[PDB]
Amino acid sequence: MKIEEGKLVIWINGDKGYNGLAEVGKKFEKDTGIKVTVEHPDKLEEKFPQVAATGDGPDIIFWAHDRFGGYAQSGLLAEITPDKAFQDKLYPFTWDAVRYNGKLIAYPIAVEALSLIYNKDLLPNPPKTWEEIPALDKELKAKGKSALMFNLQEPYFTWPLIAADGGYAFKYENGKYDIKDVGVDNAGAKAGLTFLVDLIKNKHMNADTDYSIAEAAFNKGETAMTINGPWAWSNIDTSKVNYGVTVLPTFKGQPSKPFVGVLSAGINAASPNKELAKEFLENYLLTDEGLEAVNKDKPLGAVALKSYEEELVKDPRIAATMENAQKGEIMPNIPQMSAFWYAVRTAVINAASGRQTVDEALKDAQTRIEAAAKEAAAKEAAAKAADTQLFNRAVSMVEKNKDIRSLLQCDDGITGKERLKAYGELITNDKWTRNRPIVSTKKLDKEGRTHHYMRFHVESKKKIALVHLEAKESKQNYQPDFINMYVDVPGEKRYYLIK
Ligand SMILES: OC[C@H]1O[C@H](O[C@H]2[C@H](O)[C@@H](O)[C@@H](O)O[C@@H]2CO)[C@H](O)[C@@H](O)[C@@H]1O
Secondary structure (H helix, E strand, O other): OOOOOOOEEEEOOOOOOHHHHHHHHHHHHHHHOOOEEEEOOOOHHHHHHHHHOOOOOOOEEEEEHHHHHHHHHOOOEOOOOOOHHHHOOEOHHHHHHOEEOOEEOOEEEEEEOOEEEEEOOOOOOOOOEHHHHHHHHHHHHOOOOEEEOOOOOOHHHHHHHHHHOOOEEEEEOOOOEEEEEEEOOOHHHHHHHHHHHHHHHOOOOOOOOOHHHHHHHHHOOOEEEEEEOHHHHHHHHHHOOOEEEEOOOEEOOEEOOOEEEEEEEEEEOOOOOHHHHHHHHHHHHOOHHHHHHHHHHOOOOEEOEHHHHHHHOOOHHHHHHHHHHHHOEEOOOOOOHHHHHHHHHHHHHHHHOOOOOHHHHHHHHHHHHHHHHHHHHHHHHHHHHHHHHHHHHHHHHHHOOHHHHHHOOOOOEOOEOOOOEEEEOOOOOOOOOOOOOOOOEEEEOOOOOEEEEEEEEEEOOOOEEEEEEEEEOOOOOOOOEEEEEEEEOOOOOOEEEEO
């Protein structure tokens, strides 16, 4: 089917507080009469781009922010429109994580980082280093226990150890990522994955262990430690295991460096319910009461909402979470993240299962990511060329229109027309000598067709106007067709050049 007008469908991962979120949905339905249906499909992060490209899927998708730049580039997410008053309700750094090409593409919900979770009755004192763990596992087998179990199927859980001694995804220097500098097969990444492979080789961990297997072992007290995020605390609470939440152990004297996620809520570009989605997210979910309902189901981590974080921050489990977060790094949201995760997933599973060697595994991953970065570079180049061409076309149409020139109070005399200035917004942080990105946002419609939106200024000596355009891809291999173009000049009514 296709997205249904007049209700909301929400997708969120099955490890999160989806029941709590449904409760917030029910409140919205009681107050407004709008039905909110929460679903938690498997492989949500892979299903969404498939269905959203055919105008299907949820109105709202929840995932960590790392997936969202990819979705935005593909036109699957609507730019969100929160006013200044609302934006002020959330921490600036959380908004930063959902910024793509300088625009907001989702609402931040909560900061997630992995910590070491330990059973206090089995280990009153948790180990400071990865290195102590094999000896620890020896003392525990004698009591039939084991030292450590965590999900070896998802590289999110293995990444902190790979990064510890020097591994990195993309070289982050000052503000920008150099995607041509990937650190997944450097000496640092090798040591970490090697050490993990050794735990398995030496039978302290089993390569087949996944999320549910690790969680069950810890929650039943069969293993003394696990590695997991805030969402997992709720089930441990139920289990009546006495647990602490603490800093990940060091590797080679250095902190484990978890990749930190900001759980975020994006609106499907193809949804006919964008204003309902906005109202739900801003007025119901991102409230103390709304986040409480979700958090009480499964802990969110450190929430983006300042007023409610003030309550949560008291929790030592949250302090531990933020302490691991500060030792790690906020994930990029660049579109190459999906490729990075796929490559590293295959590397870890292949190296764990003894299939490929560590050096074979990481080389293949590195090659894959480098290849993905190369095509991604070409794609960005094509996009800038295309945007430049769109801007140039609209500048021509605007500048040649006699009514618009009159509104701009152009000085057109016998020598010729006044040369007009055209430049991008505006307002997009630190691009001076009037040198600005001139970038379009992309949205798919319910038919799956690509629309390009662009805003820019045109300036005469007397007036500065703001131009908005919307172009639609042709079914041919033609240039995009302009379907809406209008100009706002201070003092004057909006002028529609194309209605
Ligand atoms: O393992 C690769 C996977 O890592 C992250 O996913 C985390 C997610 O952020 C957490 O919220 C929780 O659901 O566990 C997931 C790992 O299973 C990235 O967000 C994701 O893109 C990536 O594929």
